[model samples]
Target chain A: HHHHDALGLIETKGLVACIAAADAMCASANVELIGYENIGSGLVTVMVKGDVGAVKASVDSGLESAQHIGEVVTSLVIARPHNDINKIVIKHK
Target chain B: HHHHDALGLIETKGLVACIAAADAMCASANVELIGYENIGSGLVTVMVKGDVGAVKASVDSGLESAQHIGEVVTSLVIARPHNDINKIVIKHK
Candidate 1:
């Protein structure tokens, strides 16, 4: 997670699905791709940051498009997250 | 954080589902909930600590209950977690 107006993430079951999600997210709204986390057991999370509304829109579109390839584990947006999350998530990325 | 015999995590898409998982985990086995991580973006992970066997049982039951309520993001069991993890998860927990 990187600093921004808001934070969003889309977790998918595989790397391929996440790539598709990430691409769609970038295309959907004015958001920057912050990072990606591979939390073993094949869980992959793609992080994005932008205005809260843009982040939400990006994540929504990302999830929908990713479903075309495979299942999306989960998707969420945080208007404001604990500051420490960015430190840990960025490092893991 | 204090030491534990094992660590288990059940990640879900929503707080409601996670509540269901956490309740079943504590009710089904002898374990302590070390913490809960709401990693922004709707990921809520419930961490349990106990004997390896007990932790396994706890996570299993928790995942089952959570699944009934909503989707499970990811689930994992660590016989013993790396000490470094405590540093990252402790503050959030």
Candidate 2:
């Protein structure tokens, strides 16, 4: 299965309130949100997984929705497969 | 087993330098650093795990060391187990 990981900061007046909104957004996007545990100092860990398009769309949607709620989107990361291991092995052997 | 997650941005004069320092800190702390992938716009995704104490210390040290090396740490996250699931299931079942 393909995987995409993203990290970003969202600022809201109340941290818990923002988290709840984020949870709702992730669920509606068909993204498997693994967890949203608070890491201390108002930071939250948002882990999710799904197909490439879905994952990308989910993150984008979350960011957009979060911004409307006075949350700042700080940073993000998206990673996909790089090489075919089977092809590399066959080429070498 | 318990789990912890952390995320932060270390800004140095050179992107590679900051990443290298962050990597070293994670390794030295006996933390299981999962991956470091570059997101667009020079953002990076750093995934790591370990015991609570070690994780905390590693992050603190990493932040300090990164700053010393001309890097700015913007944010961080740490998460741990919340409840005793076995107890709850036993009560209901």
Measured by TM-score, the strongest candidate is 1
What C-alpha lDDT, on a 0 to 100 scale, does residue A57 get in candidate 1?
A: 95
* Model 1 lDDT, full chain set: 0.78
In angstroms, what RMSD does candidate 1 have relative to the true structure? 9.2
Residue ranges of candidate 1 with Cα displaced over 4 Å: A1-4, B1-93
CA lDDT of every candidate:
0.78, 0.44
List-wise, what DockQ does each model earn? Answer: 0.08, 0.03
* lDDT, candidate 1, B1-93, per-residue tens: 865468888888755466567767877888877677666656778787899999999899988877875779999999988989878668756
lDDT of 2 by residue, A1-93 (tens): 975333222333223223333543464455554433333344443444556666666666656644553334352434453355334323321
Interface Cα RMSD of candidate 2: 11.7
Evaluate residue B88 in candidate 1 and report its C-alpha lDDT on the 0 to 100 scale. Answer: 68
Pick by DockQ: which candidate is best?
A: 1
Alpha-carbon shift of residue B6 in model 1 (angstroms): 17
